[PDB]
Amino acid sequence: NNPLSGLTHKRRLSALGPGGLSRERAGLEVRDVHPSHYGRMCPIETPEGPNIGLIGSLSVYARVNPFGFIETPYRKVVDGVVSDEIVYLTADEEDRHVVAQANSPIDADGRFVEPRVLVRRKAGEVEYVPSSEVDYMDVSPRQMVSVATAMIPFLEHDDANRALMGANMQRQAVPLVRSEAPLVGTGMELRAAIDAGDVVVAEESGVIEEVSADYITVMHDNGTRRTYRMRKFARSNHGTCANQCPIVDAGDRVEAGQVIADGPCTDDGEMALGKNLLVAIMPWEGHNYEDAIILSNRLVEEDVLTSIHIEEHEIDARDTKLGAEEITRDIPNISDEVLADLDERGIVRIGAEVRDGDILVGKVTPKGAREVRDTSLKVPHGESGKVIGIRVFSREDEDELPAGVNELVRVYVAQKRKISDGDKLAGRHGNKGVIGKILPVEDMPFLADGTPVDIILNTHGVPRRMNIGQILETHLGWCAHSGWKVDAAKGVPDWAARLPDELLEAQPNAIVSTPVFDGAQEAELQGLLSCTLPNRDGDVLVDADGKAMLFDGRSGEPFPYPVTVGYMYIMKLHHLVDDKIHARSTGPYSMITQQPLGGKAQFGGQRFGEMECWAMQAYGAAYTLQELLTIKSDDTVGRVKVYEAIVKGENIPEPGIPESFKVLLKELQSLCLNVEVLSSDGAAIELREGE
């Protein structure tokens, strides 16, 4: 789906398989966070369905023994001073030592400041011992999290369930036609993109000789020349687009390890899965009721959230009994109207827009004419897009084809998809909902200078779910977008004592980084929110609390109270409404029990299960149930008469007897059971029609 999902798949520890557990045998004690998982497994990232606790992810610093036991690093301490010697310990060796905590005050020389420190004793017992027994120390505060959980800013302010959903939903994002890096990040995004391997990096040092849209030529210092090719518009395992673009000039000097070309979800070497949007937190006329989302029309007129999707189809020519199939433009039973596309070979032409019913490649199976059939590859119902490429394999030009087949063509079709009602959006903190409405840009609340907002989120869902990291993210995003400057005329203020010297001033559209368990405090945010720079005109739109006064775009009067405004990172999820709509009147049927087929690809019906019959019987609807169970599913003789009656405008007939009952009777009779259907005076009924 995107580089993060591919990287996460290769770091998965699974507890099932031929030699492990079962989804039914496994109980409730194998799905718990043991105290020995600290530094070896991630306690947050886990599936949400029946595999909860049976699948996990390895941590960032973990490594495996030559026996199969996971290790984790520690810093050796002697005489109360932390050294810089790293020793790897397994879970069976760290229960005889006292291990300190990563967030521990350490002086310049390396002596503990606090008299007592929080440690971990033998049986995972947390205690407050006086700092004189410590024997080991952690290497970093993010030692206990995986690679996808270490990409959420302000993680310590979120509940466990919401961080779980955010980590699971970061792997379902789709690549967009244009990418942009987060305004607020974590710092893990740079080495999570190089190690995934979807970018191109340079293996040696040299100068750039030639750059084009599909190749880069690098001349090394010794004399050797190396050329790198690109994958333009390649289809991934899930139908998304994988496109690589160069980000170098024609005279640059390149060092080994430097990123040379971009990738699917990459912006200048770092992973970018979404876009930055201006948010307001307020209810609006009930259009964002119960987790719905309101969007602006500027997100459709400017292609902010648009993704290409590529699909593949194929046909064959397996020599049948009499004669053999041969793909040709000659399809007798069809005219010359629906034949303009097909070139003089029988295949569509690169560039032709297809609908649902168009013929892609035409084949006539013969008998050895007036014997040929209409077997032409068509576009499956509800699918369209331009033909972007063909690939024909033939054995006459010497090729390895499965015996029997003589021709295998593969057609590709791409469609640029936009955003619409029903599409799913998400954030990094657990925010999740479908788009309820898209509004004109003149109908949207706007700031004092006339800037409309891009997305509206409801305020009723935040307090009861305990994910308050999103509001902090919006505050920090506004501060980063606008830019700030701290005054130090009378010395550094008291709240900015611990800030570095490079964070005392920033420019508009700056990029910052807040690590996962050692980042920006709240005094720092409160102090930065009152230092931001003004805009073109000398106006400060957002006051010291992070709130701004908005106007109403439908009535014109200002809203009576200030509203929270900021910037937030929004991703597009791979659950689109165009792939979930379905309907059917009549179609294919089964063979044994003549009920409608199942599934969306086979034009199937919807199951009317057991629980849905109890509601019908409790309502008292005796005729709806009978019609739903006989003349719409199984009554073979009544289906045709019902269709004719509906078309002719007459009354619907009386239902007969279902076929599945007769199948059941023959099943019971095949086990040597003498089951018969009697009448009011004996004289078993035949129950086979035929007269």
Binding site: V60, Y61, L190, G269, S513
Partner: peptide, 21 residues
């Protein structure tokens, strides 16, 4: 940091790191 060509992303961290992932 530690990458030849990388965007300059300033950080809020107050602790130093003795190991690289």
């Amino acid at each position: 940091n530690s990458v030849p060509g990388a965007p300059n992303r300033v950080s809020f961290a107050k602790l130093r790191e003795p190991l690289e992932v």
